[PDB]
Amino acid sequence: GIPADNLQSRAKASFDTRVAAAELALNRGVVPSFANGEELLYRNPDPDNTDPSFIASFTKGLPHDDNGAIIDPDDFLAFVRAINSGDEKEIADLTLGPARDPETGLPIWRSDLANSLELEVRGWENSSAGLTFDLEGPDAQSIAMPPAPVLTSPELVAEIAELYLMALGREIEFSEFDSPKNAEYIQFAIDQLNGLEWFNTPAKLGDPPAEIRRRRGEVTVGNLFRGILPGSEVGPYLSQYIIVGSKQIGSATVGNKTLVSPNAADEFDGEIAYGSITISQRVRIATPGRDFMTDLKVFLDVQDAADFRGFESYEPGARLIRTIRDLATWVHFDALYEAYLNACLILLANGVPFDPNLPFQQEDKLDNQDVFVNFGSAHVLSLVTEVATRALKAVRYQKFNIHRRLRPEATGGLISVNKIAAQKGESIFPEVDLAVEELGDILEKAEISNRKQNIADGDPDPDPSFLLPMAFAEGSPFHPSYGSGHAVVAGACVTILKAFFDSGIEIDQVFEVDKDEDKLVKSSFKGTLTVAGELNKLADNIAIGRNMAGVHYFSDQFESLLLGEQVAIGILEEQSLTYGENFFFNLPKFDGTTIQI
Amino acid sequence: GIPADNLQSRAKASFDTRVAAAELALNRGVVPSFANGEELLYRNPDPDNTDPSFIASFTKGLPHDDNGAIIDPDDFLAFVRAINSGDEKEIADLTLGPARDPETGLPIWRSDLANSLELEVRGWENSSAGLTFDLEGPDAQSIAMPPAPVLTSPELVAEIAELYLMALGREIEFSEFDSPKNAEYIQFAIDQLNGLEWFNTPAKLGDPPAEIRRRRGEVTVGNLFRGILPGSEVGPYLSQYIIVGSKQIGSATVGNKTLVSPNAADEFDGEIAYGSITISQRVRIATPGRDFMTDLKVFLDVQDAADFRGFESYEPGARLIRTIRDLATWVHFDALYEAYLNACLILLANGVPFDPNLPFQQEDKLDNQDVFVNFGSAHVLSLVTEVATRALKAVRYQKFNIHRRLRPEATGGLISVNKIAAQKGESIFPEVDLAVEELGDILEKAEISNRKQNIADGDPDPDPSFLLPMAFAEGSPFHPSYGSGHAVVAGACVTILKAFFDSGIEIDQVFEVDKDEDKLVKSSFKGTLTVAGELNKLADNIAIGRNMAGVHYFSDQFESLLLGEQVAIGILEEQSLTYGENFFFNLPKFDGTTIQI
Amino acid sequence: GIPADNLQSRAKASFDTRVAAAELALNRGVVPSFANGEELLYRNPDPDNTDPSFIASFTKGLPHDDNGAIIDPDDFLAFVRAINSGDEKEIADLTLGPARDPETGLPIWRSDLANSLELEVRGWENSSAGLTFDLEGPDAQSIAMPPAPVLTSPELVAEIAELYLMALGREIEFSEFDSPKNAEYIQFAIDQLNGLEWFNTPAKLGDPPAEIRRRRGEVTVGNLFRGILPGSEVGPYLSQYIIVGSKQIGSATVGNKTLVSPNAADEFDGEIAYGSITISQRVRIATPGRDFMTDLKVFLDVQDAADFRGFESYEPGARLIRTIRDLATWVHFDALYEAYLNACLILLANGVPFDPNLPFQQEDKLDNQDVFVNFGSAHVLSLVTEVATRALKAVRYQKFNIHRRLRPEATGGLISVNKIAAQKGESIFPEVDLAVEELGDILEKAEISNRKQNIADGDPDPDPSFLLPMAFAEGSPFHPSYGSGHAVVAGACVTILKAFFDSGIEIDQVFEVDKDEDKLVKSSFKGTLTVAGELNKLADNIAIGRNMAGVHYFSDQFESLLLGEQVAIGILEEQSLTYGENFFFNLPKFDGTTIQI
Amino acid sequence: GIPADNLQSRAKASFDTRVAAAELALNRGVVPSFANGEELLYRNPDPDNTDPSFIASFTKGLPHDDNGAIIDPDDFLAFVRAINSGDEKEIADLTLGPA
Amino acid sequence: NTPAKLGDPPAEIRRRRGEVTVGNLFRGILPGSEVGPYLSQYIIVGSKQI
Ligand SMILES: [Ca+2]
Ligand SMILES: [Ca+2]
Ligand SMILES: [Ca+2]
Ligand SMILES: [Cl-]
Ligand SMILES: [Cl-]
Ligand SMILES: [Cl-]
Ligand SMILES: [Cl-]
Ligand SMILES: [Cl-]
Ligand SMILES: [Cl-]
Ligand SMILES: [Cl-]
Ligand SMILES: [Cl-]
Ligand SMILES: [Cl-]
Ligand SMILES: [Cl-]
Ligand SMILES: [Cl-]
Ligand SMILES: [Cl-]
Ligand SMILES: [Cl-]
Ligand SMILES: [Cl-]
Ligand code: NA
Ligand code: NA
Ligand code: NA
Ligand code: NA
Ligand code: NA
């Protein structure tokens, strides 16, 4: 008899399809995640004491001493148990914030400011989201990020140096990186980073492969404060998709006739056609030169959960992203998929073709089929947004269940406390001795900057402070540094977009923001940009924006981007079982190879 | 021994969780979908001929005769086979468009306009997306929409009357429905609809339950052209969420201190804070009074696949939705989830609380836990968008595999052809005799309107035409009328938003668009609106926008809303197996009851 | 990844719970049941004959000869096949009752009385209920009762002696066991039983363990006619729960105030508060001194199925159980769970605490939770009643499918026939020679008693008769002797009650029935009774009541009590899988150990 | 050969009978229960307040104000969570009665 | 005093009551409840006796 398949009911075929995708995900196997060894390494220096200090772990929210070290190690150990359990009662039983007044229940802050504002505590954001399952994509716990840099490492000294340079450079305009007025600061930054072993010496055979891949070499004005995704280092700093608007309604080709929108110029003035309404690319303007958490008492209050969220001031109006601070403001409040949805809307409005390995992409006189629900605009619009939460569950697992890495502000706190103590011949937080020893010039500029801030904030003669100035009044979100929610979603979202569009398409005209006015100008770049390159650059812009704000390190961002890419790839693979058509997505990966799914 | 559960590996628990969700969906069972009987009822009037005419089926794209009937019944029968197979080759083998010129290869159109533009054909949009499976939610084919109204029915006569009144009312401003200058037309509309049995007589015992649920009673200015979801018929016609902006960055409460955004007024001028950038509620302005497909030859060309997409003209600028035509323009190009994403961004910017039955919604001093990835803003932002494509697969099944209902333009074409023939004592399309008999007054106004359009379009002495004027040059999308992509997505997305937010929260200040200027004014409405009511009203606005454009009937939209609600509910139910927390979504459904999931 | 459990649908969790309980019951394994070997041992004495006689088997209903032996061995063999099949046709095909008159179909009885009453036959009661499955608890056939005593054994001689002593003692008042007027009879009973090997010699090493456990030693006035459950032999003969009433509605503590029912005295006058109505403990009064089946022809008619049910006479009114006969009347008609439901209502009305290892039993200011549905009154009220039918299926299996032991009346029949024949130098039923030889004094008293009865019943000069006088006109129910429906339900029901209540609670005031009036008097008992002890005593009272009626032997009752306890324990164990709470039942068993379930 | 059934042990037949009853109950399928919409409809009339009032819900035992409305909406929300969890500790943590 | 209307929930239609009379006042709607005396025989009568 002739070999055959058999039909079954639609309902069984649907069930079996979903089981087959679960089976595909199971059959990928799982990998463990390794932490960097710091959490039980560093010990309380107190002679009669057998506790870890937890100084290199995220402990924002647990009560800290005057040096920024947690007072009671049980508070961190309890937090770790609650992270692994997820039980709401156990979470509500944790200690959060500083000692409260017995009679009134008020938290007593260190700073006059926090007490005068009557601040309450804020709590951890989804400390057990890494336990949540998902109906699609790699399970949160199936994949890994590699160990984070340790405080004593050349990589960390380079990372924190870079963050102080970004902080002190917040008022520099992207379009003026190479301008004479900025030469002194830009060259100082370049030379300082080039003076560090991470950047000036290559990895050596036998180093961890993750280090080899993410290690950077010579700093130049062309790569200063940029990411390393392919495409990020070519052409202007900002992705086209974060400054240009799009083709507008009314511009169209109808057979042999070209119509021109009466609003066509809006494309070049930062308006994205968003259906029949618009999105403006112009960002709100945080007050220039105002940074936060430059005073130790206010800093410690923030470390003790004081809720400063919403305290920033702004200038009137909005402009195309102009300064480093403006990129920090952009990433303070974005929906995590916002940048990529906006890019997707630009690509759609501009008529950029879909990946030509999808079905039905020919002229309809040939294929009799146009695309929308599947393989067209509605499809990509859902898929680019849906991956974000799947990527976030995986990065929460790394953040809280695995690595619990301290945020940059906390590292700056260690550096400041150490240096102040060393000036009195005392050793506090010797773990950051190398950073203190090597970043003297950068720290002196931060001291001066901090003094000015602390005077402006109303302290006429402040104690010296070497804290990392924060762009945001509350500093980092209430969750660990490694990885990053922004960067994991960036990695997942631009993966979907590069796969779904023809992302080899070249950009026709390249723009930058004008040096003198709030407008676009034609770039002088001579070279070719592609859609994939500008999507990678967008991911790097959002991710590095967090670093420019003071809330992530380079390694957090790069490793998160890779994690997000894995999540998106797994979702595409599982979803491939649901379609009858013969097609695939061509995806150029961050590593320069292409996977066909 | 004490009864117990056992642990297993995380990977097996993830696999078993996905299988258990698939099992929950399979255990719901499936229901058949019934079509209204027309497809094989209406017969080619040719005496020597044993074929159906397919005149009440969607046949846009297949070659039609001078009366708008398909020329070869095999063309439709092959299209039905291609819809149920999905095979790309079989789709590419279909006949699409009319005979082509040997020398140029171009389609030979009927109209001078189409020929002068050298239009090509456009093809069906995802005619087999109803075959696609999904990793989550009810399978596309597991659920049903009820049979559509038949051409001979009181319901259809009422539906098509309403669509002509909307078309002829396209220049009326929402703000001025009750103004003296509009009283003659508004009263004509109300009186005409009240003269129809559907609206002036109740359903009778024994009628189909779906008819009983969707049947409308007495028309008034307060309900004219509105939907029937709860909340839609109270307060102003447009949902707050399609005209108001939101709170802006810089407005906040930090303990006992209030900060005010320097651009706080933008909230009342239609700007949604979209991260740190903005969305403008102002819609592009299609040329007032210009309608399309009012000439029979142009109409037939469109029925024969002529690609008029992109042909509209616009005035400069943008304004808050002002006229009926502006709501048609809004729905011409929206991403399908756009309205609901925008509402969600408003609710988030305004600080509207989440559903209090979610976990962690208390002050953090009580629960030690804030929300983002799960149970907070990132969660809803992905969930509201991801349901769209699942809802679209189900509605594509109903559109193409089940009901294949002709779009309103095609019904208007039958009416026009019938009436013109009857004036010459011939009977063509007796199926629409009742609509012709009953809508004389409306059709006379359409004739006058169509003559003016046809003169403007360059025909100095046009033949009489009773066609339904289209807001869009191409008329309907290239897919069947029943149900609607917009409406099914609206149903799924507002279901998610009502469940995820505390949607009992009351609206503080109610706005409308000013009668005289492009700005918001405080409404005189004196009752109470809720977030759930205004989300339902938003769904109805987008759904009826399609009707006002000429491309759906009332029944298409209402039954699609219900289908979308079922898709979203199923997704929530299946996803409930992935969380460890003790919580549920409270969902007020379209029927007035609440489900807790 | 962290090891985890996964959720599944409620419906699957319910299914899996029920399967897990079936699996628990399966995994207990099963045990065989062994009969005592008599059924094929005793042979028809007729020289040319190769049939068993079946004289030690229950054959009530099959036609018997003049000596009480079945006429046709096929009738018993057919009955056994019908028992094991359960098929209704096969049961209806059996031979039941004596030969019928060919012309009228009437059964022709031996006795003038049965013929004058025109009695018809009664049939076997659920002869195949031991085939029935159950949704909960040990399957009927999974557990066993040990072989019954054989007719030739010292245990049986002791058993039947005791039953004749009870019969001849039916008018003795419990409260007067130790009274001078009864000394002669009471001492005769004590001395006669002490003259038998069963009671006066201990078991020997190597005897069956079941014999060792149920063997009794020295008879005393304190243990005469009592059971051997722990608690039965301490204090007054009758359980408090069969004579005392309860606290009444209106007696309550409300905060610091005590209210006293206007009906409080009813507690001491035998009224149980039964919700807002009452149960009276006072029993109907069967005519003193009237016994049944003392005439051989009437006896044989009863053995031949004559339906004498309902023939007893009563005196007016009702009284607290006073005499041995009154306990026999109590157990003639009780619902099988009645005694224990009544005890449960007493305990509830009196506020006896539930088992403190159940949840929510603390003051509600501590636990915020009171009990009713689960772990409270409604729970125990259903559970104590539901176990009865499960216990009855198991005892039916033993009764009919396994042991088929003759009822005491039939043994008395063998004894009478044997002794009458021996007086004429003939040997009939030599199997009961030992009982005849050893119980001469008891049999002479029965002869005299029987003569008086037979004279009163209208025979002026009766033949001598040594039959066991029956309390009930119909003698035993229509099913075998081993085990007992009453006793198996007693064992199951008091198991539930001891587990569910705090059954270590001590009784405050102990009562007995007054020697002179129908009322309670304070007992002279100096000692402590507990709830568990009085529940065991109640079980023994109901079980021995059947023996006092003439319808069971000691071994029937004790072994049935153990079987019932097993059934209840198995139900509790299986049900333990259905609850989420952390709790268990502490159960003091009949053997003096405690199981925690 | 003549089609037939086969016997099995009594213990397996009892097990299979209990499974078949569980299977009959599972094969009935399940239906959702819908509430009347009031719980999140009625709102605390306090203008500066974004809470439901729960006035049409059973709140006997939670502390009420002088009008019979619960004082703290978290008390009812916690009672709802305790109802759906069943956990004894969570139940014991609820607020029951007044100061 | 008004009947349910077409379109009302089926559960309302089933349980809705009409005109109140002395014969139905404070009674239920199960079949049998509205015929004969208000109290069931089973809550007032005793039984045949032993
Ligand atoms: Ca195509
Ligand atoms: Ca919270
Ligand atoms: Ca309690
Ligand atoms: Cl099916
Ligand atoms: Cl696989
Ligand atoms: Cl995040
Ligand atoms: Cl890969
Ligand atoms: Cl695993
Ligand atoms: Cl299920
Ligand atoms: Cl669609
Ligand atoms: Cl539902
Ligand atoms: Cl279920
Ligand atoms: Cl087991
Ligand atoms: Cl029985
Ligand atoms: Cl046991
Ligand atoms: Cl077995
Ligand atoms: Cl079944
Ligand atoms: Na767009
Ligand atoms: Na590409
Ligand atoms: Na709600
Ligand atoms: Na009681
Ligand atoms: Na006890």
Q: Return the HEC string of A27-40.
A: HCCCCCCCCCCHHH
Which residues make beta-bridge pairs with B273? B278
Residue A19, number of CB atoms within 10 A of its CB: 17
Structure-solving method = X-ray
D23 CB within 8 Å of a chain B CB: no
Could you tell me if residue B333 is left (phi over 0), alpha (psi between -120 and 50 degrees) or otherwise beta? alpha
Residue A299 near residue A467, CB atoms below 8 Å:
yes
Pairing mode of beta strands B257-259, B252-254:
antiparallel
Phi, psi values for residue A426, rounded to 5°: -115, 150
Measured in whole angstroms, how far is the alpha carbon of residue D13 from the centre of its chain?
36
Residue B505 near residue B353, CB atoms below 8 Å:
yes
Distance CA C215, CA C200 (A): 10
> B595 by DSSP, 3-state: which?
strand
Note the residue count of chain B.
Answer: 597
Gap positions in chain E, given as the residue before each gap (C–N > 2.5 A)? none
For residues B231, B236, B242 and B247, what is the CA-based torsion angle, rounded to 10 degrees? -100
B3, B6, B10: residue with CB nearest C576: B3
Resolution of the determined structure in angstroms stands at 2.0
Residue A183, number of CB atoms within 10 A of its CB: 12
Residue C282 near residue C318, CB atoms below 8 Å:
yes
Q: Which residues contact B158 (CB under 8 A, 6 or more apart)?
A: B193, B196, B197, B198, B199, B216, B554
Give Cα separations from E17 to E1, E12, E14 (angstroms): 9, 9, 9
Residue A123 near residue B368, CB atoms below 8 Å:
yes
Which residues make beta-bridge pairs with C588? C594
Chain C CB contacts of B27 below 8 Å: 9, 11
3-class SS letters over C319-352: ECCCEHHHHHHHHHHCCCCHHHHHHHHHHHHCCC
Measured in whole angstroms, how far is the alpha carbon of residue B44 from the centre of its chain?
32
Which of E47, E48, E49, E50 best probes binding to C when mutated, by most C CB atoms within 10 angstroms?
A: E50
> C572 by DSSP, 3-state: which?
helix
Angle between helices C183-194 and C440-456 (to 10 degrees): 130
Distance CA C563, CA B235 (A): 74
CA distance B250 to chain D (A): 21
A398 CB within 8 Å of a chain B CB: no
Q: Which of A255, A318, A260, A254 is nearest to A286 (CA)?
A: A318
Distance CA A248, CA A274 (A): 9
Pairing mode of beta strands A124-125, B369-370:
parallel
Residue A517, number of CB atoms within 10 A of its CB: 10
Pairing mode of beta strands A511-513, A520-522:
antiparallel
Helix and strand numbers (H, E) in chain C are: 20, 10
* Long-range CB contacts for residues A349-354, cutoff 8 Å, separation at least 24: A349/A246, A349/A247, A349/A248, A349/A272, A349/A273, A350/A246, A350/A247, A351/A247, A352/A501, A352/A502, A352/A505, A352/A531, A353/A501, A353/A502, A353/A505, A354/A380, A354/A500, A354/A501, A354/A502
Residue B280 near residue B350, CB atoms below 8 Å:
no
- Distance (angstroms) between ligand 10 centre and the Cα of C560 equals 74
User: Which DSSP category does B273 fall into?
Assistant: E
Provide the CB-side half-sphere exposure for A189 (13 A, CA). 27
Residue C219 near residue C194, CB atoms below 8 Å:
yes
Give, for A280, the enclosing helix (H) or strand (E): strand A277-280
Is B29 labelled a binding residue? no
- Distance (angstroms) between ligand 19 centre and the Cα of A539 equals 16
CB contact under 8 A, C367 and D91: yes
Gap positions in chain A, given as the residue before each gap (C–N > 2.5 A)? none
B318 CB within 8 Å of a chain A CB: yes
Residue E37, number of CB atoms within 10 A of its CB: 7
Please report, in angstroms and rounded to a whole number, the separation of the first and last CA atoms in chain C: 35
Structural Rg of chain C based on CA atoms: 25
Pairing mode of beta strands A271-274, B271-274:
unpaired
Mark which residues 340-379 of C lie under 8 Å from D by CB: 359-360, 364-369
> A59 by DSSP, 3-state: which?
coil
Give Cα separations from A65 to A44, A69, A468 (angstroms): 12, 5, 19
Pairing mode of beta strands B271-274, B277-280:
antiparallel
Distance CA B235, CA B243 (A): 14
A486 labelled catalytic: yes
Residue A35, number of CB atoms within 10 A of its CB: 18
Asked whether A and E share 3 or more beta-carbon pairs under 8 angstroms, the answer is: no
Distance CA C346, CA C248 (A): 10
CB contact under 8 A, B595 and D32: yes
Q: Which of C179, C343, C181 is nearest to C274 (CA)?
A: C343
Give, for A98, the enclosing helix (H) or strand (E): none
CA distance A466 to chain D (A): 42
Largest Cα separation within chain A, whole Å, is: 96
Residue B83 near residue B401, CB atoms below 8 Å:
yes
User: Which DSSP category does C292 fall into?
Assistant: B
**Residue ranges of E strands in C471-592:** 511-513, 520-522, 586-588
Burial class (CB in 10 A: 0-12, 13-18, 19+), C296: buried
Distance CA A46, CA A49 (A): 6
The residue type found at C450 is N
B516's tokens: 């005289």
User: Which DSSP category does C135 fall into?
Assistant: S
For residues B99, B103, B109 and B110, what is the CA-based torsion angle, rounded to 10 degrees? -100
Mark which residues 31-50 of E lie under 8 Å from C by CB: 49-50
Burial class (CB in 10 A: 0-12, 13-18, 19+), B521: middle
Pairing mode of beta strands A369-370, B124-125:
parallel
Q: Which of C293, C577, C542, C312 is nearest to C408 (CA)?
A: C293
Give, for C473, the enclosing helix (H) or strand (E): none
Distance CA B384, CA B380 (A): 6
The alpha-helical segments, DSSP class H, found in chain D are: 10-27, 38-41, 73-85, 88-92
- E44 to chain C: closest CA residue: C277
CA distance C1 to chain A (A): 5
Query: CA triplet B528, B531, B532: central angle to 5 degrees?
Result: 105
Q: Which residues contact C83 (CB under 8 A, 6 or more apart)?
A: C127, C128, C130, C400, C401
Distance CA D70, CA A262 (A): 59
C197's tokens: 């090997």
Give Cα separations from B86 to B32, B58, B90, B129, C592 (angstroms): 20, 18, 8, 8, 76
Helix and strand numbers (H, E) in chain E are: 1, 0
Residue B318 near residue B269, CB atoms below 8 Å:
no
Which residues make beta-bridge pairs with A280? A271, B278
Chain E CB contacts of B213 below 8 Å: 7
Active-site pick, A64, A332, A403, A479:
A479
Burial class (CB in 10 A: 0-12, 13-18, 19+), B132: buried
Distance CA D33, CA D28 (A): 16
The alpha-helical segments, DSSP class H, found in B314-376 are: 324-333, 338-349, 364-367
Q: Which residues contact B245 (CB under 8 A, 6 or more apart)?
A: B266, B267, B268, B269, B270, B271, B272, B273, B278, B281, B346
Helix and strand numbers (H, E) in chain D are: 4, 1
A205's tokens: 């055979």
Angle between helices C554-575 and C10-27 (to 10 degrees): 150
Phi, psi values for residue A396, rounded to 5°: -65, -40
Burial class (CB in 10 A: 0-12, 13-18, 19+), C295: buried
Give Cα separations from B351 to B354, B362, B392, C91, C147 (angstroms): 9, 14, 30, 78, 79
CB contact under 8 A, A141 and C6: no
Residue D56 near residue D42, CB atoms below 8 Å:
yes
> A266 by DSSP, 3-state: which?
helix
Write the DSSP string, A63-88. -B-TTS-BS-HHHHHHHHHHHHH--H
User: Which DSSP category does C451 fall into?
Assistant: H
Q: Which residues contact B504 (CB under 8 A, 6 or more apart)?
A: B530, B531, B532, B588, D40, D41, D42, D43, D52
Residue C239 near residue C541, CB atoms below 8 Å:
yes
Asked whether B and C share 3 or more beta-carbon pairs under 8 angstroms, the answer is: yes
A131's tokens: 């336990």
C267's tokens: 């507690």
Chain E CB contacts of C314 below 8 Å: 50
E26's tokens: 């404070």
Q: Is the peptide bond before A86 cis (omega within 30 degrees of 0)?
A: no
> B586 by DSSP, 3-state: which?
strand
Residue B373 near residue B257, CB atoms below 8 Å:
no
Measured in whole angstroms, how far is the alpha carbon of residue C114 from the centre of its chain?
28
Give, for C465, the enclosing helix (H) or strand (E): none
B505 CB within 8 Å of a chain D CB: yes
User: What is the residue whose two structure tokens read 């005619």?
Assistant: B127
Structural Rg of chain A based on CA atoms: 25
Chain A CB contacts of D93 below 8 Å: 89
Which of the residues of B are catalytic? 479, 486
| CA-based torsion, B515, B517, B518, B522: positive or negative | negative
- Per-residue b or e along A203-241, where b marks 16 or more CB atoms closer than 10 Å to that residue's CB: beeeeeeebeebbbeebeeebbbbbbbbbbbbbbbbbbb
Ligand number, closest to the Cα atom of B9: 8
Measured in whole angstroms, how far is the alpha carbon of residue B32 from the centre of its chain?
23
CA distance C336 to chain D (A): 25
What are the binding residues of A for vanadate?
A: 399, 407, 484-486, 546, 552
Helix and strand numbers (H, E) in chain A are: 20, 12
User: What is the residue whose two structure tokens read 């810089």?
Assistant: B250
Which residues make beta-bridge pairs with C596? C586
Burial class (CB in 10 A: 0-12, 13-18, 19+), C49: exposed
CA distance C306 to chain B (A): 52
Write the DSSP string, B98-160. S-B-TTT--B--SSHHHHHHT--B--EE-TTGGG---SSSS-TTSS--PPPPPTTSHHHHHHH
Give Cα separations from A267 to A261, A270, A272, C89, C538 (angstroms): 10, 6, 7, 93, 95
Distance CA B118, CA B96 (A): 16
Measured in whole angstroms, how far is the alpha carbon of residue C300 from the centre of its chain?
24
B206 CB within 8 Å of a chain E CB: no
Return the domain boundaries, chain A: 1-597
| CA-based torsion, C283, C284, C290, C291: positive or negative | negative
> C156 by DSSP, 3-state: which?
helix
A206's tokens: 């036998």
Which residues make beta-bridge pairs with B258? B253
**Domain made up of A1-597: CATH architecture:** Orthogonal Bundle (1.10)
Distance CA B564, CA B578 (A): 22
User: Which DSSP category does A145 fall into?
Assistant: -
Q: Which residues contact C33 (CB under 8 A, 6 or more apart)?
A: C144, C145, C397, C398, C402, C403
Chain D CB contacts of C581 below 8 Å: 86, 88
Distance CA A448, CA B559 (A): 67
Residue C137 near residue C570, CB atoms below 8 Å:
yes
Which residues make beta-bridge pairs with C221? none
For residues C42, C46, C50 and C55, what is the CA-based torsion angle, rounded to 10 degrees? -30
Measured in whole angstroms, how far is the alpha carbon of residue A423 from the centre of its chain?
35
Distance CA C333, CA A20 (A): 64
Give Cα separations from E32 to C289, E15, E36, E47 (angstroms): 48, 15, 8, 21
